[PDB]
Amino acid sequence: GSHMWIGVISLFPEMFKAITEFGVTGRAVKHNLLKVECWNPRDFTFDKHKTVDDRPYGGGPGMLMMVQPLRDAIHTAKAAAGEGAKVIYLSPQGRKLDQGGVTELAQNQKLILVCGRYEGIDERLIQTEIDEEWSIGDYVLTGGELPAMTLIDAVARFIPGVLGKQASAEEDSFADGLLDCPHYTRPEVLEGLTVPPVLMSGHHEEIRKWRLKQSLQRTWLRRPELLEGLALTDEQRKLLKEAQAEHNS
Amino acid sequence: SHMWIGVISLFPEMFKAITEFGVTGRAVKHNLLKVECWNPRDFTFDKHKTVDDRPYGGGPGMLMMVQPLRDAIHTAKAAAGEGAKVIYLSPQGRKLDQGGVTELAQNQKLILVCGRYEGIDERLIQTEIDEEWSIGDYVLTGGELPAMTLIDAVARFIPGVDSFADGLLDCPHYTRPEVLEGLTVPPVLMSGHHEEIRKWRLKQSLQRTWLRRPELLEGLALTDEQRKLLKEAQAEHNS
RNA sequence: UGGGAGGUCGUCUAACGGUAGGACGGCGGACUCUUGAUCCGCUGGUGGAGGUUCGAGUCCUCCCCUCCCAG
């Protein structure tokens, strides 16, 4: 079957239950499609006080993570993963994640994700132990665990069998480089807003064209830059032109 | 002054990841942050506690059921009282950045709706949501991680607890030992002269922002000092 | 509203001139789930008149509606 192994270095491994025990990802773990193993630098501290942070040279802001426990946890994980494992550091200074980046990352059979805490980690550990740096966004969080879980989740949607029997038709934003179209479910009418008749028509071809047209229109209006480097069928061009002409004028 | 966050989620226990650990966890124990959850499942009225439903027009996937979700949001909105903004986590919403974080931070109470499956009914977005927010241009299986990400980012602004502070990437950091794998700490950081260090670190932030994320640089009004240091760094990059 | 072609459940697709079926949809139900998974019932059609024939979705006439070709 399909399997992916993700090694994680984190002071708070229990946080990862958030993805391993719940939802689609929880079932994927429960079906062995996805494996996540964690190592905690705290289990590697020679300190009698199980101390895991150290002071930054130059004084200043907060604390940095202590080098020894963190380095030892990385070497232990790296050794267990064996050969062919790419080591990633979660950091806001890293490559900003997008769907293309998710597909590329999804190209790895094994990954080790290093989650920082405090002011971050010693720059030299990054030079000597890290392969790639990735950011989940231009904002600062208190630790790398949320970013790591985010990365894991995004790639897990790409593991065959995770979403279910023939999930090729499963529609989500960016999946095909376009934003998703709007969705509707029961009731037929509530809060005075009805459902577009075409979705109730049972007319298959029109529903397909409506959905595609909605997706093009929404992408155009909210995120056109996605539109700048896209490959499209004649049908998509036509459908988009209809949409731009109609919202406009 | 503290922050209150309402959350609508089918998996409220996921939020322990932020309420029981690290800085945000400490914030919770000291009552500097409250995170209350409502689960649409507690609002169902059927034998199987159904919280999803099929989308009209057929095809694969499910959407969240309108009624339980709606009822939960109205209940949370009711508990929050006046002034609570309802935010829906979605990849089609406004992309979070440090500015968006500061604006969200102004709000005293927020309610966060976490989607699952293929999403939520469009009419709920039109009728119950004030603003839509995305954590990035990629797709997740649920809104819980994005909700926690947002909560974590804004919590940093809660009294009693910088990179992006000035629009720049952070500078590199070092701690003991002085030599690690043949790599020594830059002498300036050990010189003990606060002024030389400040200028060195600032020069590093400027250089790094330029090299990794030059676009961040376009929107800024650098001080005379910053312009000089960046100019120096660009000259060193390829002299 | 000139010259060709064509009308079957909401849509798609079958039926020798012999009891109109299937898939999807819509409604509803089980799975005993967090099932973005899979099953199971129910609903529903020959556009309309004539006529031929023991019998017509099918063949003939007319009417109507629809697509294609220059309004």
Ligand SMILES: Nc1ncnc2c1ncn2[C@@H]1O[C@H](C[C@@H](N)CC[C@H](N)C(=O)O)[C@@H](O)[C@H]1O
């Ligand atoms: N946007 C982000 N993407 C990836 N990791 C992040 C992000 N924001 C914070 N982190 C991680 O969580 C912690 C953030 C803080 N320790 C501050 C980090 C520090 N500003 C730095 O330059 O790395 C670090 O471990 C970061 O790696």
Ligand SMILES: Nc1ncnc2c1ncn2[C@@H]1O[C@H](C[C@@H](N)CC[C@H](N)C(=O)O)[C@@H](O)[C@H]1O
């Ligand atoms: N980029 C994102 N930012 C914030 N929330 C997200 C993001 N991606 C997915 N989600 C959450 O994940 C839930 C389930 C998603 N599969 C829904 C995606 C939806 N079909 C769309 O493409 O717009 C969504 O309802 C959101 O709550």
